[PDB]
Write a protein that binds this ligand. Structure first.
Ligand SMILES: OC[C@@H]1O[C@H](O)[C@H](O)[C@H]1O
Ligand SMILES: [Ca+2]
Length: 306
C-alpha cells in the first residue's frame, strides 16, 4: 500500500472539456468507473439556471473533450453516483426538487434520462445557513449508510441509517461534526474509504485568499471524529499552492477517482487523482453563477528523492 502523504503535490491537466453550445459551465463532478470507462455526471449552468448532465462514457481523459454532453430533463444538481451492492442497483443522489436531497435508481447508470422518479433522501434543515443543506455525499460501511453535507456556513453535518434500511429518507435530523469559519468549511464535502490504509478520508472545499481549495481530514470510522490532515491554504489537500495548474487558481467541487463504483467510495492511495472544477484565472469577475467552470484532473506526484 501507499500512505496518504504529509505534504500533497500534484500535476494538473488542462481543462478537460468545454461546455457545449448553450451552456456556460460544467461543475460539481461525480465519477465512477463503468465497463472500463469513465462515467461522469455533473451540474451545468446555462445563461439562467443550474441543471445536471452526463458525458457519454469515455475510455481516456483525452476523450472527455469530445464526449457527448446530455442534459437531464429532471435536474439532479450536485450529483453523487454509486452502485449499492446490497440492492444490486445504481443510485444518483442530488439536491433540490422534491426534497432537500433526493435519490433515484437505475440498472444502467449510463442512461442519462433513464433514472427512476426521485424520492426523498433527506428532509432536514439547518441553522445559520443562507443556502440550507447542499453538496451531499453518501458512503457506507458494513453497518450503516451515512449522508454528509455542508451549508455554506462553516459546518459539516452527518446523519445515518442502518445499512439494511437503505434506500429510505434519512429524515429530518442531522448533527454538526466539524465547525469552523464559513470560509474554512464551505462547500463540496466528499468522503472516501482509503484502500489498504484502514481509514477514511474527507475533503471539504474552503474559500482561500488566492482561490478555492480543499482541506483534508481523516477518521478511523464514518461515525468517528474527524481530525485535520492538510488544512492550510499554503499546504492544502489541493489548491493553487500545490495543484500544478497554470490555468486556474481555484481547485473546487469534484470527486477523487474511485477504484470501484460501490457505496464504500473507495480510493486507491497509490493512484490518487482528483476530478475538480477550475476556471480561467484571467477571466474578469462576473456573477458566480456564470463563472466558466471546467473539469480538470490532478494526479499526485510519485515518490522521489528530494
Ligand atoms: O453548482 C451549484 C453549486 O455551486 C458550487 O459549485 C456548489 O458546490 C454547488 O452546490
Ligand atoms: Ca459532490
Amino acid at each position: 500500500s501507499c500512505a496518504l502523504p504529509t505534504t500533497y503535490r500534484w500535476t494538473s491537466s488542462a481543462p478537460l472539456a468545454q461546455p457545449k453550445d448553450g451552456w456556460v459551465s460544467l461543475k460539481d463532478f461525480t465519477h465512477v468507473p463503468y465497463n472500463g470507462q469513465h462515467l461522469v455526471y455533473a451540474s451545468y449552468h446555462d445563461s439562467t439556471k443550474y441543471g445536471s448532465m452526463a458525458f457519454s462514457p469515455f475510455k481516456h481523459w483525452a476523450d472527455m473533450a469530445t464526449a457527448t454532453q446530455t442534459g437531464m430533463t429532471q435536474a439532479a444538481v450536485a450529483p453523487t453516483v454509486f452502485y449499492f451492492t446490497p440492492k444490486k442497483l445504481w443510485f444518483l443522489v442530488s439536491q433540490w426538487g422534491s426534497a432537500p436531497f433526493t435519490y433515484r435508481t437505475s440498472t444502467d447508470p449510463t442512461k442519462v434520462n433513464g433514472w427512476s422518479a426521485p424520492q426523498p433522501l433527506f428532509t432536514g434543515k439547518v441553522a445559520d445557513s443562507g443556502t440550507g443543506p447542499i453538496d451531499q455525499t453518501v458512503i457506507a460501511d458494513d453497518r450503516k449508510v451515512y449522508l454528509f453535507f455542508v451549508a455554506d456556513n462553516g459546518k459539516v453535518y452527518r446523519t445515518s441509517m442502518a445499512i439494511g434500511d437503505f434506500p429510505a429518507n434519512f429524515g429530518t435530523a442531522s448533527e454538526v461534526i466539524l465547525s469552523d469559519t464559513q470560509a474554512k468549511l464551505f462547500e463540496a464535502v466528499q468522503v472516501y474509504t482509503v484502500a489498504g490504509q484502514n481509514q477514511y478520508l474527507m475533503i471539504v472545499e474552503a474559500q482561500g485568499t488566492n482561490g478555492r481549495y480543499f482541506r483534508s481530514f481523516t477518521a478511523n470510522s464514518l461515525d468517528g471524529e474527524w481530525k485535520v490532515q492538510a488544512g492550510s491554504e499554503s499546504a492544502p489537500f489541493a489548491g493553487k499552492a500545490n495543484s500544478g495548474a497554470s490555468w486556474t487558481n481555484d481547485v473546487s467541487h469534484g470527486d477523487l477517482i474511485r477504484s470501484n463504483p460501490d457505496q464504500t467510495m473507495t480510493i486507491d492511495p497509490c493512484r490518487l487523482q482528483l476530478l475538480y472544477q477550475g476556471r480561467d484565472k484571467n477571466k474578469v469577475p462576473s456573477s458566480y453563477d456564470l463563472a466558466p467552470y471546467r473539469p480538470g484532473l490532478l494526479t499526485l506526484y510519485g515518490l522521489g528523492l528530494e
